[PDB]
Design an enzyme around this catalytic site. Sequence first.
Site, short mmCIF file in Angstrom:
data_model
loop_
_atom_site.label_atom_id
_atom_site.label_comp_id
_atom_site.label_asym_id
_atom_site.label_seq_id
_atom_site.Cartn_x
_atom_site.Cartn_y
_atom_site.Cartn_z
N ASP D 54 0.83 -1.20 0.00
CA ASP D 54 0.00 0.00 0.00
C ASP D 54 0.87 1.25 0.00
OD1 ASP D 54 -3.00 0.79 0.41
OD2 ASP D 54 -1.90 2.06 1.82
N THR D 87 -3.84 4.96 -4.37
CA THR D 87 -2.93 5.85 -3.65
C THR D 87 -1.62 6.03 -4.40
OG1 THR D 87 -3.94 5.05 -1.61
CG2 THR D 87 -1.90 6.30 -1.44
N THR D 88 -0.99 4.92 -4.78
CA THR D 88 0.26 5.01 -5.54
C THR D 88 0.04 5.72 -6.86
OG1 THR D 88 0.76 2.85 -4.55
CG2 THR D 88 2.27 3.69 -6.22
N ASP D 391 -8.48 -2.74 1.32
CA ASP D 391 -8.52 -2.11 0.00
C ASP D 391 -9.64 -2.71 -0.85
OD1 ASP D 391 -6.46 -0.37 0.52
OD2 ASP D 391 -5.26 -0.97 -1.22
N1 LIG Z 1 -5.38 -7.78 -14.38
C1 LIG Z 1 -4.80 -6.60 -14.68
N2 LIG Z 1 -4.27 -6.36 -15.90
C2 LIG Z 1 -3.69 -5.19 -16.21
N3 LIG Z 1 -3.58 -4.17 -15.35
C3 LIG Z 1 -4.06 -4.26 -14.10
C4 LIG Z 1 -4.71 -5.51 -13.68
N4 LIG Z 1 -5.10 -5.34 -12.41
C5 LIG Z 1 -4.72 -4.09 -12.03
N5 LIG Z 1 -4.10 -3.45 -13.04
C6 LIG Z 1 -3.57 -2.07 -12.99
O1 LIG Z 1 -2.54 -2.01 -12.01
C7 LIG Z 1 -2.69 -0.85 -11.19
C8 LIG Z 1 -2.48 -1.24 -9.74
O2 LIG Z 1 -2.90 -0.18 -8.89
P1 LIG Z 1 -2.53 -0.24 -7.34
O3 LIG Z 1 -1.06 0.04 -7.21
O4 LIG Z 1 -3.10 -1.51 -6.76
O5 LIG Z 1 -3.36 1.00 -6.74
P2 LIG Z 1 -2.92 1.69 -5.36
O6 LIG Z 1 -2.26 2.96 -5.81
O7 LIG Z 1 -4.21 1.87 -4.60
O8 LIG Z 1 -1.98 0.69 -4.73
C9 LIG Z 1 -4.08 -0.30 -11.43
O9 LIG Z 1 -4.00 1.07 -11.82
C10 LIG Z 1 -4.66 -1.11 -12.56
O10 LIG Z 1 -5.01 -0.25 -13.64
MG LIG Z 2 -4.33 -0.33 -5.60
#
Ligand SMILES: Nc1ncnc2c1ncn2[C@@H]1O[C@H](COP(=O)(O)OP(=O)(O)O)[C@@H](O)[C@H]1O
Ligand SMILES: [Mg+2]
Lengths: 212, 52, 48, 532, 528, 76, 364
Positions: D54, D87-88, D391
């Site tokens: 996170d 958030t990231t 989350d």
């Molecule tokens: N199955 C998938 N295939 C391709 N991209 C994905 C998949 N699942 C998530 N993503 C992308 O990866 C990113 C992960 O975001 P994440 O880092 O979990 O958000 P946060 O900032 O809340 O941690 C998301 O923006 C999403 O668009």
């Molecule tokens: Mg995320």
Amino acid sequence: LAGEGISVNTGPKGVINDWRRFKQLETEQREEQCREMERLIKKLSMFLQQYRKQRMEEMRQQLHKGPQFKQVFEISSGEGFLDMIDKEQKSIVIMVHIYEDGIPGTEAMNGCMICLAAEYPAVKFCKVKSSVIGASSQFTRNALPALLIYKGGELIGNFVRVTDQLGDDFFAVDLEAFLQEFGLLPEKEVLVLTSVRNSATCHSEDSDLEID
Amino acid sequence: TNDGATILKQMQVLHPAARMLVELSKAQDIEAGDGTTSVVIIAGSLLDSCTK
Amino acid sequence: LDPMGGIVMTNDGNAILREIQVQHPAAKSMIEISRTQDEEVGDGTTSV
Amino acid sequence: PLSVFGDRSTGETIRSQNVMAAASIANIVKSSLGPVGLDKMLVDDIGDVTITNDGATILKLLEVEHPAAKVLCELADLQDKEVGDGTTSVVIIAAELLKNADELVKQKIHPTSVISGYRLACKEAVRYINENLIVNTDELGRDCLINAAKTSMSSKIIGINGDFFANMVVDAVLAIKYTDIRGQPRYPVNSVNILKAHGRSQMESMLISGYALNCVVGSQGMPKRIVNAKIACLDFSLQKTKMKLGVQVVITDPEKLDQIRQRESDITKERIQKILATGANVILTTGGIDDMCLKYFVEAGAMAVRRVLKRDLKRIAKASGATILSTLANLEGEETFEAAMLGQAEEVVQERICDDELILIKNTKARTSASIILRGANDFMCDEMERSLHDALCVVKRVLESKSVVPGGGAVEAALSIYLENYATSMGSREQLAIAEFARSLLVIPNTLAVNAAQDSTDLVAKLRAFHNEAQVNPERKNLKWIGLDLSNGKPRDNKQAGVFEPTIVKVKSLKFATEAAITILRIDDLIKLHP
Amino acid sequence: MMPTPVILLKEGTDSSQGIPQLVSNISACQVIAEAVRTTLGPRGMDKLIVDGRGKATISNDGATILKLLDVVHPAAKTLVDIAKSQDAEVGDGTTSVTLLAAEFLKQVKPYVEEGLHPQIIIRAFRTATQLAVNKIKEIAVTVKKADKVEQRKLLEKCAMTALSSKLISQQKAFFAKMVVDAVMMLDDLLQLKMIGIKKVQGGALEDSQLVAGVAFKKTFSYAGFEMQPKKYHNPKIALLNVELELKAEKDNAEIRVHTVEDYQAIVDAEWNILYDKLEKIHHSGAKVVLSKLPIGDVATQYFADRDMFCAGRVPEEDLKRTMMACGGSIQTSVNALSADVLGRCQVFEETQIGGERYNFFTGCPKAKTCTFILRGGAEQFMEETERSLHDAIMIVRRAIKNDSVVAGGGAIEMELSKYLRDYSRTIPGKQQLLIGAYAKALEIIPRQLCDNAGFDATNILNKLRARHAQGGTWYGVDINNEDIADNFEAFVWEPAMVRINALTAASEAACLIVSVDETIKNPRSTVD
Amino acid sequence: ASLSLAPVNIFKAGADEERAETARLTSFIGAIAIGDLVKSTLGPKGMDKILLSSGRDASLMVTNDGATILKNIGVD
Amino acid sequence: VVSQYSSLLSPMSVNAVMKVIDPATATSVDLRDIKIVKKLGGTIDDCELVEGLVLTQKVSNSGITRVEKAKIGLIQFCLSAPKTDMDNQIVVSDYAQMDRVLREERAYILNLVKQIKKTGCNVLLIQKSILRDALSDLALHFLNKMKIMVIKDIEREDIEFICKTIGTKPVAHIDQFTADMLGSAELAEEVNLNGSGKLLKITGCASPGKTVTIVVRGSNKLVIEEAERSIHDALCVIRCLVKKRALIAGGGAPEIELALRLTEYSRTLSGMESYCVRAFADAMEVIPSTLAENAGLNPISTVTELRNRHAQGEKTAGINVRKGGISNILEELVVQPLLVSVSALTLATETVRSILKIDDVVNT
Ligand SMILES: Nc1ncnc2c1ncn2[C@@H]1O[C@H](COP(=O)(O)OP(=O)(O)O)[C@@H](O)[C@H]1O
Ligand SMILES: [Mg+2]
Ligand SMILES: Nc1ncnc2c1ncn2[C@@H]1O[C@H](COP(=O)(O)OP(=O)(O)O)[C@@H](O)[C@H]1O
Ligand SMILES: Nc1ncnc2c1ncn2[C@@H]1O[C@H](COP(=O)(O)OP(=O)(O)O)[C@@H](O)[C@H]1O
Ligand SMILES: [Mg+2]
Ligand SMILES: [Mg+2]
Ligand SMILES: [Mg+2]
């Protein structure tokens, strides 16, 4: 050599920044100098009677139970000591141990603090070498083993030469009883073994609310 | 911040003339509420002319 | 050699790993793994 | 001349310093984005260890000295508080916006023009997202919720086990649904009590159709299980009665002292008897219970739990239909306990979980509640599981509240970049450049996703941009708006059909917060740092 | 990481690798570039650097500024090295090389951050640099007439353009004419040691003069020097490498006599040796005597008795310049002083210049050497004037080698950027992005000119881009008119080799910086 | 402004500067002190002085001569 | 920093000032009637102009929120066990006395709550108390059982504002607590700010007072502080427009007009004072130069163009930043009240005159 009534005009004014430059440094230094002066010099110038329960207290003091057993906080900077004693809530007691590596009468004290930390999580047992603090030569040579105790930002414990009233084979039971004689150890609290943890954070509760 | 009074009073100026200009900005804020930067700029320019 | 002065003589994995103080946090994770295995079933610490 | 006791930085120096600080914060967490992202593992220099992915947690644990880096840190915290996801992404977007805006400023573009362009770009991006990139969940069913939960849990320690964790999350969220006044069904997440305990594997995590307490019975003589529980929730300790400060006992005739001392405990005896005479089986109190009242409960064969947390007790009372009673006093001045004050449940047990015991209130009546017991390998893994689970719960709540979702995998960012690049030509002359730079900065998310997968980021993002340009140019090729990235194979893919979804609120709030932070930082052109 | 009881490398070894260290290298190169950023163009500004000893060096030359900066960053030293290389090969453009290299690195930084393989970037730079060099060689303006008047005008214009960035830019026409004349008086090799640079405190810049001959300061006159005449109207100069003073015959020599008659004979022999040397010099017909070795007081008085001029301890390069100007030969022996080895100048005179005495050898008709006498109010003033004149002299020499010129003011670089963008628009697309980045990076110099001049660089750049696209080759930045103008018609000329070498060196530095991926720093030994 | 009383410092460490007030004051104090020291040794009824050398030799002389009195004093 | 949100903030500030004053027969504005409440979270686009009052204190009586047709009552006594001003004690020498003490305390608290409820009150605000327990748990339970919202820990210095807004009259003893000393409101609810906190809003008051509350929102604390300062600047501008209702063009036009006219005035004078007035005019010429600077324009050319245009007769000619040059600014809607320039000039001249009468500095 006349005109001694100079009434200087702006010299000290024009150098006010450079004057504050080392005045603030000197104030910072004498902060810890005064904090330490409260310890140095003044004390450096100089069959129930057989504790039936001592043994059993020793066995159930071996109740680490949880994750590992941790270690006493080691302070490697005088400013670290000053800004940790200045900060932190003053409700709970802070205990400090002074030591030098190699000298006898140290490992037993560290073990006693390690065992006592589990008994009283409220206390903040910590240790620090006399070299980094800036202790005097006499205090370093023949006053090292001392249990500094602070509460409320002021000294509460006035103990040096702890080996004199404890020897070198004292256990955590002995130190606990000796401190409780003077009423300095916070009283124990009932505790149970949590699974591991429950809470995550505290914020807007937004609990259940049945509504029509 | 962009407010002249806040900028002036938020930094210790250590010079008497600068302190009086800070008080000037505070007074202008009290009577007017803006122009706190303009009044200080005007005073500085007036004294710069006074130099020559 | 217990830092409190005692001596622990064993070949149980959990006690041996519990008596060791380490700095690398991966080692801490492994020790916690040993503790979890000991608490859950009481055997197989060295194996896990 | 100034004679200010401090340090001053002015012009391009302070701007570059702020941009460097923001870039450092972004680069700290850039490696933990997307399914090919990897966790971090912090140490709190006392031996404490925190393994996490996170972004908000990582930025909250770290100690930061630069003001702009702090600004990004509380941006991350605010994004977590208001949404719970992205958030990231919002941190990275804000830092990239700041970097590109500073480049524009270095090109002798006035910062106010850049700020105006950024505001216009943010407004138009939100409008375009709401008008072209939204997908309604009404025609999807439970599949959209499951896929949203799985997408949220990707990149987390529970990613592979999503097939099971998503079902558990959706069931837990749907269990706590309530419709308030004006008929808007609200989902009060944070009412799902998350309990952690190391032990069995991840798949042994239990979703409780009721409530879970991290407390045990006060006495070992009481039964450990009651079938038809009549829960009595109390908010006062059951101990020996002690007079207040304003009341003092002074004895002049010794014959009364024994009666005084006896009444001191007979008062609580009578209170306990009044509570028990109504048929109560489980007694939960926020205060403590001494040995005498514990024995009183023991003889009746009833539960008695002390030191129950206030929030847990409130949740139990709401779920079971009980009413919290801080005192026994009706409106007649007497001391009584009506039987209608008792909650009910189909069972109350004290199960054993890894050499420890906890109380489960199973299947409360008049309301359905939920709780999750997470089983991991150690404390660190359980903590990361709890964070990821929170989350996912927040994501499901956002999806169920507002029924609009958008495709994931960087499709939204690419579409926004193409649209804003095509649109910047119709507004101003320098805010044109600002909007173009906003569009270019929006492409950092797919670039980071591709880089984390060790794939050809340039070619993949070029293909994505070509697909989205074709979608925005040809009216009959509008199904290409959902073409996102597939990180496993490193090829573009229709994410809407694949099942990668996000709440629209995540993207909207992230864009708004990032734009506001970029504007806030971009205003500074002079820094005075007073000596302490 | 684990303790590894026996570590591999020596303790204290620092290592950095991957994309972050390359980004750090690019940032360091940017930091180096911005130190000389404001020194470029007719609106450039000088920089003052103080060393540990407290001596200040005021300069506008980029190479000098970079040398005075104690750069220790391994990646940043490349910019200083290429600045030195550009100074050595060409002598002008020491700031343009740094700006171009840093702009290349900055332009390709985003692609590096995206994980692009650096070999692709290196290949793109090589291709773009080859194409740009070929285009420069194709479009450079040359005249196939070899007219002397046209050649002189071309050299003067090139010198003026080179000089219009320093503190002597107000008198740039004057100094350009002086430099062109001085260079044309060099014979065939254009040796820099054949051009004297004398710096005399006091006086205005317009008081500085070029001597069609040779001049040097008076050198520690002995007693009786003031009795010698200080002006001659057709002197014959006797350049000598001889110690003309009473001294021991040899270091190992020892005299053993056992009679007072032999003692007197030995004393008279020493005196007669000295007098024979002096009389051999005098009978040669020479009137001015110059010696690299000291000339004693006895010889000074002897020459003063004959109305001759003598000056010992003359610096060796001054003697060589005197030989080149007058046409004699330096003689280590006075036994054969024929008319062949005697120099000749029309007028010799000793005059005072700013509280110092200088000897002047004017009127030489066959001189292959010069002497610049520079005036100014401060030592750094003369030093910076000398540096600017050195830049102009190097430019004029290179133009003498080949009179191929391109317009300045960034026009050549805007044309190159347009050509490179047009080329890049016809290739698959992985190289197209990098070549377009190179073309955009080529725009740094006109933007820097506008920024230094206080313009709005964006509007001027847009106008320049439109003008180059719609037709027009030599349109650059008109600093005075706040606008753009045909810089070829404005006589802002520049030798082609300047831009050729600038592009080549910048590309080489950028490729070398991009290629490196790991930086290892072994610990300093013997810090002391 | 003034060479010394300016926000920027233009001197080496230890250099000093006294403007009109301080220069005139110091000059007058020094001159008047010298005059009052050498006086009272003037005229037929003038008296002598004792000059103790502070050096290793510790030379001692008593003199009425003004020149000798003023020679053997460390004057700043 | 709120120039982008001006389209929202400026009407809000104008309405806020016009709410707390009488548009006719008003000579001053007391800005203490416009309370600014800063809540982290959201964007500045979420700023609000609630016409009631906003209380940051949470509702003690959890489980009951959003009362309608509220009858708010403000009390200054304590709902706890009896306690006289002088020190008091209760002596017990019999168990019956213990039982009677408990029963009588319960009866006293119940009578207090019943007397409060009999008046029709349904919202209770309790002033903060230190020496005595403001609200015992027994009293809170009785109030909850009678469906009354309880909001304790009301600051003493907020009593005047609360009474002026709602219309409640403070009650310091239960004897005087009657229906006429209550405040009537349309709605009194607690609203959560999307997880950023809970605010208590009382919107809609019969016979509303001359007070308004501005709720400021923002992503981070710094922008919220700056937004508060900017809103205060707007309110102060409107207040300056209230007293000495005169308007002048902005854009540096008054400064350049001052420079030109004072140059002429100095030319009409003689002696050293002519030089001094010329310097005064030249110094006033600095604001147009600073405005031409910071905008990318050429300061010298822009200032000369301003001077020439004003000499031609253009009194409203000023610096235009939107068009990147000089033009009339009354068509750019750049105006400021007269008692900004007048005040700045007067205060600056007075301070300069004060400084010029100083010739020595003495340390202390
Ligand atoms: N199955 C998938 N295939 C391709 N991209 C994905 C998949 N699942 C998530 N993503 C992308 O990866 C990113 C992960 O975001 P994440 O880092 O979990 O958000 P946060 O900032 O809340 O941690 C998301 O923006 C999403 O668009
Ligand atoms: Mg995320
Ligand atoms: N849109 C505008 N166009 C031209 N000038 C403006 C504009 N807005 C404000 N100004 C000028 O900027 C000056 C500074 O105002 P401001 O910075 O808001 O407060 P202060 O007067 O305290 O600095 C004012 O004197 C005003 O005349
Ligand atoms: N009169 C002029 N007008 C426009 N540009 C000029 C003029 N004179 C020189 N330049 C530009 O200045 C640049 C070189 O600046 P200078 O400091 O002299 O050398 P360097 O290349 O070492 O910085 C050249 O690119 C040239 O185009
Ligand atoms: Mg203002
Ligand atoms: Mg086993
Ligand atoms: Mg040059």
